[PDB]
Design a binder for this molecule. Structure first.
Ligand code: KAA
Ligand code: KAA
Lengths: 502, 506
């Protein structure tokens, strides 16, 4: 048995000699007549022993096995597109005996080859192609083995070659995105692109990446959300806009966070958050039914040997109000919602966290304590899709104030399998109120909150030209893909996930 | 009145409405019908008609406010790219007192809701005759006067929302942008391509010759580069056995702004196993000609290289596209023979090209590499003569370190660029898939980078290891979406087709 580095060195020398001899081991064009998939669909009815001499076809793929059965006969296990096809290299059937001997000497497991041959089926019932001629298209210079998660992510190409289920997760991911586009296109939304480099990042509470433009001699930030730009287009008269695109957040990596991820955001003039709850139910349950075939999905959050959950996407989804549900979950009344700005509320919330052992790193502000208490006591009860509604204004600096509950806003988040999938609200369109909330945010930054929003004057000026009553919405695409591919790790649904180095 | 005085006065008026509970920013106005549907449904009304039995709620932005005595006032209501006249009549309003109150309250630019009955003026103008108008969002700033409009480009580009409010041709350019992207997805989906997303933050940037943006990740404690192209990720997926992939997405290049460059821009890149670049010329001809025809109704498009006040040109997208070879057309344009193409990597050839650029007054800032000198000469002598869609083919290897060597012309590659209306649109080639020859070209590129070439590629060892597992013979393609939007909207400035283009600050 040879050694993988010794093998690489021998196979490199062999391919070099092919070059110096003029054997052209990286040819320019091979014309494929038919895919492997259609070859199987056309010919897998044949009878054992058959050999259709009147049909000549060219296929191509990757050798996954080379098994010899004699001096005149060699079997190649050809793979591609998710399927297999046996090449039955028989000397009698080949272009010549001299050329037959030579091509079989050349080929190894892993090479890309083109086969020109006839359909057939072995005595043992295996569908095959019987070649007149095989062409080496691209030799594989390394030894092919994949279970350990680290190698699959650093070398996704090996993962795709060896693990058929991986291609399917990314087909599902592609179907998610394509469904969303045609859902919103049908509603009249315009698909738009807005800057990913901003003088001032905003649209979310997140830590941004910073970079530098040499010619303009200015710092820029990668966007954390396109929200501010979308609301400026609504001011401009484009009543329905959406964007599926990459966001960037300088935050830690875990099972549901990657530093670059994909969201869909859309904005709808003359709608409120109640309208968006209906659209969300309709879109999300529709997507799940279209992709999986049912409203029910089985999710394994601790891998396959762990506990199974049945998540039920039948609309209408359950709704819970944040502050009232938290009171029921803690067993104690909280301050009146108009007192959430005060230091007494902050300390009251602080004490509750201490008593209930809910950790919260500094700064221990009212908004961050409430977040920690929600995740601990509410979010973990959201197995099926659940709307969590009416967030305190102090957590929602871009959301319009609630119609009848002072201190709250017209906001919702959708949770599925205890994880946040959507964030939405009636948009704050009062520019003076928006400017006050920015000033609060910039104070929360000066007082230790790495993720608090910057003041965006240019955005406040836009609101001064008149933003119609509007409602916007954001969905984390990667996370949806997780829950439709039974992946408990976001790295399963990212082709090349962010990794620590060597 | 002064524009700043107007802003101060209107802010104070609106603030007094809040303090008096007049709610100038109401939560919900339930619209019954869009303006577009209203226009279609009641365009069949006869002149002078006034439906007494149809009451509808619409909304929009007041574009103009014209009084006609104290009992009648017309509002020109805009939205969705269309216009609807509100014929506000005191006799039909909620009351004559409410009529005075709302007309004095409202100004040009306000967002209003309108509840009323369809009608048509004696002059034949489709109207709505309101029972009640509601302010939904006041416009606090004085809008550019209805006379001289909004024409100054600096203002349009910095306040794109203002541009959109006042210039309907702007909305049309971005509708055309959307259709371009949607057509490409349909074309490529139908051919079986899988739409993919590959990383925009890279340990090292690759896939192009460009200067990158650098950034930093705190938790992982490393520098990252914003991507200059997705190319290397795509070719690794073809090694992985996904024979057809594509991606329409942002690229980032830390280079100067001009009429055809923005620091961030959008490309479609696709890779197709078992194809070469001749196959991609046919595909490009079909996609692009079909795109123009489907979107504009014609294969002929009008082109003004010098603005609307100047010469108009008809540009024909009917395939086949003209095909020329780079080196020979360059030699033609110069009137002078360049060195044999197997000599394009020598220093003596770089010297000759440098001498020529000096002589022809083609500027090239340092580093004056063969590729950059060649790129400048092409831009000066060939790009300007590509009006109709044109394939420029068979670039020398030294400009194409990821492109496969030409199967019969030593020193050249199997590459083409599509040029339309004096602009580069596409870049494509048969993909280099010999990993030993790809490492060599990486090494030369690193040497140049040591000698201070901001744009030279890094040695990507992970990519080279990938090629050693076997990349099938493949062909790949990159198209500038912004650049297609330019030529399909007769725009000579890329800022016309980016919603928020990068600008130097105030
Ligand atoms: N005006 C309405 C608000 C719309 C969306 C708002 N601008 C916004 O960005 N909200 S968000 O909640 O911060 O992000 C949207 C979704 O992105 C997802 N998300 C957030 N951070 C990450 C990370 N880091 N990785 C993956 N997915 C993520 C998650 O599902 C969120 O619900
Ligand atoms: N293997 C095939 C190569 C495919 C494309 C290759 N990876 C690449 O990046 N080529 S490129 O020419 O550098 O860019 C592709 C297109 O992007 C467009 N482009 C390039 N720079 C800019 C800038 N700065 N702004 C706008 N558009 C731009 C232009 O249409 C180019 O043809």
């Amino acid at each position: 048995s040879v050694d993988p580095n010794q093998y690489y060195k021998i196979r490199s020398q062999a391919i070099h000699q092919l070059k110096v001899n003029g054997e052209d081991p990286y040819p320019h064009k091979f014309h494929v007549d038919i895919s492997l998939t259609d070859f199987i669909q056309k010919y897998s009815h044949l009878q054992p022993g058959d050999h259709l001499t009147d049909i000549t076809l060219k296929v191509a793929g990757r050798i996954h096995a080379k098994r010899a059965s004699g001096g005149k006969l060699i079997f190649y296990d050809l793979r591609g597109e998710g399927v297999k096809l046996q090449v039955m290299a028989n000397s009698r059937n080949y272009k010549s005996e001299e050329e037959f001997i030579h091509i079989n000497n050349k080929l190894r497991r892993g090479d890309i080859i083109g086969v020109q041959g006839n359909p057939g089926k072995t005595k043992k019932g295996e569908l095959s192609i019987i070649p007149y001629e095989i062409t080496l298209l691209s030799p594989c210079l390394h030894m092919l083995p994949l279970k350990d998660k680290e190698t699959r992510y650093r070398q996704r190409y090996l993962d795709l070659i060896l693990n058929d289920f991986v291609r399917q997760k990314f087909i599902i991911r592609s179907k998610i995105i394509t469904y969303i586009r045609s859902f919103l296109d049908e509603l009249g939304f315009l698909e738009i692109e807005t800057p990913m480099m901003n003088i001032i990042p905003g649209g979310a509470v997140a830590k941004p990446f910073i970079t530098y433009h040499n010619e303009l001699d200015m710092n820029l930030y990668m966007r954390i959300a396109p929200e501010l730009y979308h609301k400026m287009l609504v001011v401009g008269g484009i009543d329905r806009v959406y964007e599926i695109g990459r966001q960037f957040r300088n935050e830690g990596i875990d099972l549901t966070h990657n530093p670059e991820f994909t969201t869909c955001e859309f904005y709808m003039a003359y709608a409120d958050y109640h309208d968006l709850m209906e659209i969300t139910e309709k879109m999300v349950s529709g997507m799940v039914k279209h992709i999986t075939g049912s409203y029910k999905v089985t999710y394994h959050p601790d891998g396959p040997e762990g506990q199974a959950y049945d998540v039920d996407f039948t609309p209408p989804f359950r709704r819970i109000n944040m502050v009232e549900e938290l009171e029921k979950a803690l067993g104690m009344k909280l301050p009146e919602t108009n007192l959430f700005e005060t230091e007494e509320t902050r300390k009251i919330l602080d004490d509750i966290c201490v008593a209930k052992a809910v950790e919260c790193p500094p700064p221990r502000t009212t908004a961050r304590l409430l977040d920690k208490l929600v995740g601990e006591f509410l979010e973990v009860t959201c197995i099926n899709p659940t709307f969590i509604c009416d967030h305190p204004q102090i957590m929602s600096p871009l959301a319009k104030w609630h119609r009848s509950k002072e201190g709250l806003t017209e906001r919702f988040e959708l949770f599925v399998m205890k994880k946040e999938i959507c964030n939405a609200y009636t948009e704050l369109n009062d520019p003076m109120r928006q400017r006050q909330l920015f000033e609060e945010q910039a104070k929360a930054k000066a007082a230790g909150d790495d993720e608090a929003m910057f003041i965006d004057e240019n955005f406040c000026t836009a609101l001064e030209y008149g933003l119609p009553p509007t409602a916007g919405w954001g969905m984390g695409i990667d996370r949806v893909a997780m829950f439709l591919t039974d992946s408990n790790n976001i790295k399963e649904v990212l082709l090349f996930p962010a990794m620590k180095p060597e």
